[PDB]
Amino acid sequence: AIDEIKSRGYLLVGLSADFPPFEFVDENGNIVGFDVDLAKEIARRLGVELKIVDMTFDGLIPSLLTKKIDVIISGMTITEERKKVVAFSDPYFDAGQVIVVRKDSDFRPKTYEDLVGKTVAVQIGTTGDIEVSKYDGIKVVRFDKFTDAFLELKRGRADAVVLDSATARAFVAKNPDLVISSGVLSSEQYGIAVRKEDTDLLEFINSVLRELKKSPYDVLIEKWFS
Amino acid sequence: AIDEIKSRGYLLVGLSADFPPFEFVDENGNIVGFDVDLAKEIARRLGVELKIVDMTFDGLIPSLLTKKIDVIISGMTITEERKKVVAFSDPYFDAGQVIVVRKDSDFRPKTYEDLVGKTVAVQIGTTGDIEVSKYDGIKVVRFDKFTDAFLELKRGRADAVVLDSATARAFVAKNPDLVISSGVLSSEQYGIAVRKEDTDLLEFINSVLRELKKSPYDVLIEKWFSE
């Protein structure tokens, strides 16, 4: 696959641009997002242009098998059923919701059932909003911005926040007064998919993911512990 | 504290240079190593020279408390007892063991108990040797060099290797046929110590550590999941 991509001069990436912030159409009409940036990095490393081929999500695996695309990068969860059909890269994104509480409390909810009888702050319209709104005995307070749901928690006016894992860990890393009490709920891991026989491109992609995840701290460890 | 450091023109870092590869004395009498490289980074970013004050490990906290040094960077484990006396930075080093296995396998041990009934390669007399040798049902295969323990694993002659997280990570980075299957098996971490009153210097040190730990992936997360 790699020689054919390099000869053609562009990488064909299938996605369905109706999944912000992974892939979506911005105010300028461009397809952008977290997954699009990984696709752009892979194409740059291969020395080729990126050609996005947008289609419905259910079209992506058939397109890959028909060779109309080289790779799928589209918020695609690695599952056993998909593994029978396509090869995935190492997981590149851990999806799901978590429950955040004050570190100095005793309260350690593990599930939405543990939040019955409590006040929970969520960001309007998000998965956490939709989930907690199923539970009539949760007192739900809704915020335009997730930062203000955390501020409500910090002030003791909510008992917990529910938010996606990536965003919540990023925030809690900056706010040592909060802690993630649950595991990741409805967890999924996303993978980059490529035809089973195209193991050259698969291992190239696993190499780019490794690189993206290496920090100067990792390089320092390599310097002194090799 | 920062104004005073900059006025003086040098950062005083205390350490005990008897702990390779964290801090030790090289062939030419220079004090070098992982911790020294962190100290040099911090001094560079403050715009000052680094002045290492070498002393015995038990002398470090008293030297800090009597203001003979600005900071300790010396393989110092964060403990509740020391937290009563000094302020620590974010943890900057996980000292515990990890378990390494072949990637093309379903075997993903998480604990020493998961290695029971398996064959584990180790470097002779290291922590990993000492720790696994406690478990009766583990067949232990011992080598003078950790590289040969990994070779035993790669060759299919052992099911896993146990090694400190840092050396395992450095090796696995160049050997994608292997994976670190466990978290760190114990929770000891090193921290950079400063005086509790020196909160500007502590915040500056944390900002250096945080930036060192940021990968391009972390920056991409920040790009797409911020507000």
Residue numbers in the entry:
A (entry chain A): 1 to 226
B (entry chain B): 1 to 227
Give the article text:
The structure of the apo form was solved by performing multi-wavelength anomalous diffraction experiments, collecting data at three distinct wavelengths. The structure solution unveils the presence of two independent polypeptide chains in the asymmetric unit of the ApoTmArgBP crystals. Similar to other arginine-binding proteins, ApoTmArgBP is folded into two distinct lobes, each consisting of a β-sheet core formed by five strands, surrounded by helices. β-sheets of lobes I (residues 23–110 and residues 210–231) and II (residues 116–203) present topologies β2β1β3β5β4 and β8β7β9β6β10, respectively. An important role in the swapping process is played by the hinge region 232-KKSPY-236 whose extended conformation hampers the association of the terminal helix with its own subunit and favors its anchoring the main body of the other polypeptide chain. Using the program DynDom, we computed a difference in the closure angle between lobe I and lobe II of 20° for the apo form, whereas no difference was detected for the holo form. Indeed, the C-terminal helix of Apo-TmArgBP forms interactions with residues at the closed interface between the two lobes of the adjacent monomer, an interface which is not accessible in the Holo form, since locked by the arginine ligand.
We identified the arginine binding protein form Thermatoga maritima (TmArgBP) as an ideal system for arginine detection. Additionally, in contrast to the vast majority of SBP that operate as monomers, TmArgBP forms multimeric assemblies at room temperature. One novel element emerged from the present study is that the protein forms a dimer through the swapping of the C-terminal helix.
